[PDB]
Design an enzyme around this catalytic site. Structure first.
Site, PDB file in Angstrom:
ATOM      1  N   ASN A  39     -30.855 -18.433   4.483  1.00 23.36           N
ATOM      2  CA  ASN A  39     -30.177 -19.202   3.444  1.00 23.36           C
ATOM      3  C   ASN A  39     -28.795 -19.494   4.015  1.00 23.36           C
ATOM      4  OD1 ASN A  39     -28.885 -20.305   1.269  1.00 23.36           O
ATOM      5  ND2 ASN A  39     -29.545 -18.717  -0.167  1.00 23.36           N
TER       6      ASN A  39
ATOM      7  N   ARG B 218     -34.222 -21.853   2.997  1.00 21.19           N
ATOM      8  CA  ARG B 218     -33.910 -22.361   1.680  1.00 21.19           C
ATOM      9  C   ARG B 218     -33.324 -23.755   1.895  1.00 21.19           C
ATOM     10  NH1 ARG B 218     -28.690 -22.300  -1.954  1.00 21.19           N
ATOM     11  NH2 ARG B 218     -29.636 -22.967  -3.954  1.00 21.19           N
TER      12      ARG B 218
ATOM     13  N   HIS C 286     -32.200 -24.342  -7.759  1.00 19.09           N
ATOM     14  CA  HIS C 286     -32.310 -22.892  -7.960  1.00 19.09           C
ATOM     15  C   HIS C 286     -33.705 -22.570  -8.444  1.00 19.09           C
ATOM     16  CE1 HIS C 286     -27.735 -22.881  -8.893  1.00 19.09           C
ATOM     17  NE2 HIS C 286     -27.918 -22.478  -7.643  1.00 19.09           N
TER      18      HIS C 286
ATOM     19  N   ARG D  79     -17.401 -27.366  -9.083  1.00 22.72           N
ATOM     20  CA  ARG D  79     -18.068 -28.530  -9.676  1.00 22.72           C
ATOM     21  C   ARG D  79     -17.731 -28.700 -11.141  1.00 22.72           C
ATOM     22  NH1 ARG D  79     -23.860 -27.024  -7.133  1.00 22.72           N
ATOM     23  NH2 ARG D  79     -22.689 -25.274  -6.234  1.00 22.72           N
TER      24      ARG D  79
ATOM     25  N   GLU E 122     -34.377 -14.405  -4.328  1.00 20.37           N
ATOM     26  CA  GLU E 122     -34.890 -15.668  -3.838  1.00 20.37           C
ATOM     27  C   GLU E 122     -35.631 -15.469  -2.504  1.00 20.37           C
ATOM     28  OE1 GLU E 122     -30.767 -16.698  -4.348  1.00 20.37           O
ATOM     29  OE2 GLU E 122     -31.435 -18.721  -4.979  1.00 20.37           O
TER      30      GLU E 122
END
Ligand code: ADP
Ligand code: ADP
Lengths: 398, 398
Positions: B7, B91, B180, B241, B384
């Protein structure tokens, strides 16, 4: 107390004289073709008497002078003299942060109104011709300006601030303002009466569904959160507006389609919403029929529209920590039983359940929920002129 | 079979070597400050041994070379040579319209990933860097790409379509994708187990709160609505963001400040969120501390952030028609008892009530709600990497 409510357009002037003792509209009128040839004033008196006069109306000042003559007419009028008009009220869209309540007119407010407009990214500037004419014709009469952004000025900072660089808020005034304030405040007041509780003890979600659509979370009588924001574009999908989309789509589209800032603004405000999705119309009546006759795009546009309203009800249920009632008003909210059905289906899980038969009734304040539902759902016609008059009376009183 | 899961971020690289025979994580690691000074790689072996090496890591290729050296270390490693790594799972955030399921890496996947650079500016470039680094270091090892978007492909059209002109959806693929996915799917599965019901019978709201944040409504095991959209910018306010703001603010800002499309994209993705509001940091730990020491901007940033998550819980409660549980995961979700408190306060009205003491426990799958609350609130560490490895195994196996 009798309040004269004025709404001026480029070449027209609508008015209503309302008796606040019984909130009855004594006379309703319209001046058209002002500044043009063949001007005309038409007045309807409460008892079914109509007056029409063809006369030249060069300016709004002339029109207002005629309005007064028609209101005092011996048989078709409703008052003996101009002195019976205790106050005048006018609605303006944007009051920014300068206006947290309705205001008493004077030279100061006229400037502040102009400033609020030039700092805002709004299209149509406010039409002041009606307000000006009023000052000359009736110098001694209190005039109240009512703002559509005013009701939402009670929102807390964590609701009205965007998660943008703080300086933009300070340098350009970027924050959430909200609109339809007058409508939301009025139906929130009617809803408290129907709940049989003083407003301070109520938690209401108000849905003004019209060509423009917005939802407000009203806590104890004050707006605490609302769907539109810096401009009337934020929130729900509407007739021609896209609502809240992924902001990254804007520059992406500008690069792909080679668009200027003005073009992207027009695309988002006039070519989107249910019009943009359906490829057919921005009129919900037309889409509803089209959807039944099997038009897929129309069906999809109504699904998107109802789904977003449904989500906002969930959103404001968290904001308010459980709502006592949900209110539907404006063009779609008051008249469309089918759109209300699409919106309210599948919400029993959060205490909302409606009666399909009660939901068919039209043009009336009515609770359409089943008697066992935890959350009441009211259909309440919004009355713009009356709301403006109540605002005017409150200010002129206090 | 042993799978290496990668990742990659702008200046970091997380990895896990997992033995698929029993799904055990043999070693877990992190390379930080890549391309900066004082680079560092840290590795944790299953038996608790920790290795740390201060060395210069100019590029992701250098970091990956060190990762291999750390995995093969005689005492702190877990394998004898690079050849014991049977496959690599990566990922990747955006695969666009063409790639929305896991895929064996090839020329076409590479093309799709580079074409979506503009759709996931903060993520696709670094993900690509890690894939290229892997191709150079271990040319002969199978690589599988696992997209953040796959899990959300079950969303219905009325959820994923924007109320924009329909042709834009057709011509440019503009629609909501969501991200996600791997994290949301994993914790949704763990939550069903904790509810002691078959996934199909559950309604769960999953909140992945990290540098990037997103919420998903999971109905019967399938994603039905999610907060991010066309790009990872939509929805919640995040570290840097802005999330869902009034879209009209984009053209407005471009004109006021004379910004190009590239600059406004950077402003919204890199200078906004809690960083933009606080003027201090994009790290929630730092803000929390600063807020407590009385820093107002930091306090306002955390209020805006928690408030927005709270609203999404209300929104998805309507989407799901009553949820069975709310799940918190990722950096902030798993570790911040105080941020969870800010988010979960004032929701008893919709069945959510937590126990302040249980909420203090860390690094454990646990129900933190009071026993009488209608909605369960679980804290579930996300994994993940095991999910990516499962996909890698399946694809490489067939
Ligand atoms: N019976 C109806 N069924 C569905 N839609 C309706 C119905 N009556 C009115 N509308 C819609 O309401 C809108 C006009 O309402 P209005 O309150 O005047 O809007 P606005 O508040 O934006 O000025 C139009 O889009 C129209 O198609
Ligand atoms: N104890 C904590 N309290 C508040 N925030 C935390 C805590 N621990 C981590 N965080 C925040 O969570 C985020 C970590 O992001 P995330 O995407 O989950 O990646 P990672 O698992 O690598 O830390 C950071 O913004 C960080 O500041």
């Amino acid at each position: 107390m009798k309040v004269l409510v004025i709404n001026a357009g480029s070449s027209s002037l609508k008015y209503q004289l309302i008796d606040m003792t019984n909130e009855s509209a004594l006379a309703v009128g319209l001046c058209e073709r002002i500044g043009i040839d063949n001007s005309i004033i038409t007045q309807k008196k409460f008892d079914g008497k109509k007056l029409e006069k063809l006369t030249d109306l060069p300016t709004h000042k002339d029109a207002l002078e005629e309005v007064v003559k028609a209101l005092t007419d011996d048989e078709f009028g409703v008052i003996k003299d101009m002195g019976e008009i205790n106050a005048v009220g006018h609605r303006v869209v944007h009051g920014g942060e300068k206006f947290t309540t309705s205001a008493l007119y004077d030279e100061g407010v006229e400037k502040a109104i102009k400033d609020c407009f030039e700092l805002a990214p709004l299209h149509n500037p406010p039409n002041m011709m009606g307000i000006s004419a009023c000052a000359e014709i009736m110098p001694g009469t209190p005039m109240v300006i009512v703002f559509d952004t005013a009701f939402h000025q009670t929102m807390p900072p964590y609701a009205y601030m965007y998660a943008l660089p703080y300086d933009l808020y300070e340098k350009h005034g970027v924050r959430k303002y909200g609109f339809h304030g007058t409508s939301h405040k009025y139906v929130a007041e009617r809803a408290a009466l129907m709940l049989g509780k003083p407003a301070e003890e109520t938690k209401i979600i108000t849905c003004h569904l019209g060509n423009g659509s917005s939802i407000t979370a009203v806590e104890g009588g004050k707006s605490v959160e609302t769907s539109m924001g810096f401009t009337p574009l934020e929130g729900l999908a509407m007739g021609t507006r896209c609502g809240s989309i992924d902001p990254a789509i804007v520059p992406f589209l500008m690069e792909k389609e080679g668009l200027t800032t003005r073009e992207i603004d027009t695309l988002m405000n006039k070519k989107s919403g249910v019009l943009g999705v359906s490829g057919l119309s921005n009129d919900f009546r037309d889409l509803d029929e089209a959807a039944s006759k099997g038009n897929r795009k129309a069906e999809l546009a109504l699904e998107i529209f109802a789904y977003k309203v449904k989500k906002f009800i969930g959103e404001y249920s968290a904001v308010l920590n459980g709502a006592d009632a949900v209110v539907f008003t404006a063009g779609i909210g008051e008249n469309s039983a089918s759109i209300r059905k699409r919106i309210l289906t599948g919400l029993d899980g959060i205490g909302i359940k409606i009666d399909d038969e009660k939901n068919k009734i039209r043009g009336q304040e009515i609770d359409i929920s089943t008697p066992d539902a935890k959350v009441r759902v009211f259909v309440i016609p919004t009355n713009e002129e009356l709301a403006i008059a109540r605002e005017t009376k409150e200010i002129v009183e206090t």
